[PDB]
């Protein structure tokens, strides 16, 4: 029973227009299924592409886990993120598949494990992976503009947030009804921020404000 029209009227504010964001105005469809397999940049070792499994579906996002890792470092990725790609992309490129940082077996076991986890897997088909949206050429956010953003400290959660500062190619994100412990800076073209209405559109859940 939170609603954007009322909330903005109430707080005498406006929502960032969709054109500020590196997000599609029509959000992407998420046709992934739990259990599918893909290649993902290691969120803790960005020079590394690893095999990942879909653990959960939420909205336009995938909850992912790097195969052979513990269950403690699952990350979220939009289906149109360039950090995920279909199995075989490295091979196509001539790149290597790497073990994850969190890898739980003796390191020399890697080749066998790769063989074991890729056999009979359900691989995410290419068509499921969506066109990355274009970078707006300017930072058009203004202080006070309301938006929907991922709580970087708890990224299963998308929450109502406000632009607190705008500085060059960067914006300071604050979360309505939460302290500064949850604030953060990102680039204006970050993929962790969304225009109001995103959750409704994607079928994800928007968190209520803190208060």
């Amino acid at each position: 029973d939170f609603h954007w029209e009322e909330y903005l009227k109430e707080t005498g504010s406006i929502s960032a227009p969709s054109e500020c964001f590196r997000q599609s105005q029509i959000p992407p469809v998420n046709d992934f299924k739990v259990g599918m397999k893909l290649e993902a940049r290691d969120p803790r070792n960005a020079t590394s592409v690893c095999i990942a499994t879909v653990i959960g579906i939420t909205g336009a996002r995938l909850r992912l886990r790097l195969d052979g890792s513990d269950n403690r470092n699952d990350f979220w990725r939009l289906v149109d993120s360039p950090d995920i790609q279909p199995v075989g992309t490295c091979e196509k490129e001539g790149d290597l598949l790497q073990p994850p940082l969190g890898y739980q077996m003796n390191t020399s076991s890697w080749p066998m494990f790769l063989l074991e986890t890729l056999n009979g897997s359900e691989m995410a088909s290419a068509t499921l992976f969506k066109k990355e949206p274009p970078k707006p050429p300017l930072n058009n956010f203004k202080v006070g503009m309301k938006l929907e953003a991922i709580d970087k400290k708890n990224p299963y959660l998308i929450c109502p947030a406000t632009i607190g500062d705008v500085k060059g190619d960067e914006v300071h994100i604050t979360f309505d009804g939460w302290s500064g412990a949850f604030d953060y800076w990102c680039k204006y073209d970050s993929r962790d921020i969304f225009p109001a209405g995103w959750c409704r559109l994607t079928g994800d859940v928007l968190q209520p404000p803190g208060t």
Binding site: D151, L157, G177, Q207, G210, T211
Partner: peptide
């Protein structure tokens, strides 16, 4: 009424 909200 209220109590302050936690994060789910």
């Amino acid at each position: 009424v209220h109590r302050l909200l936690r994060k789910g």
